[PDB]
Amino acid sequence: AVCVYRTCDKDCKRRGYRSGKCINNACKCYPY
Numbered sequence: 443a444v445c446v447y448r449t450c451d452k453d454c455k456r457r458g459y460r461s462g463k464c465i466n467n468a469c470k471c472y473p474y
Contacts, residue, residue, distance in 0.1 A: 445469055 450469040454462030462471045 445464040445467065447464050450462045450464050454469075454471045457471065459471045459473045462469055464470075
């Protein structure tokens with residue numbers, strides 16, 4: 443499988459963070 447922006451974004455959003463981004467094969471979260 444590969445890094446899913448929508449899955450990582452939704453998860454991150456519901457993980458107590460503002461949103462997440464997948465770049466360079468690495469999904470970095472972003473809190474409020």
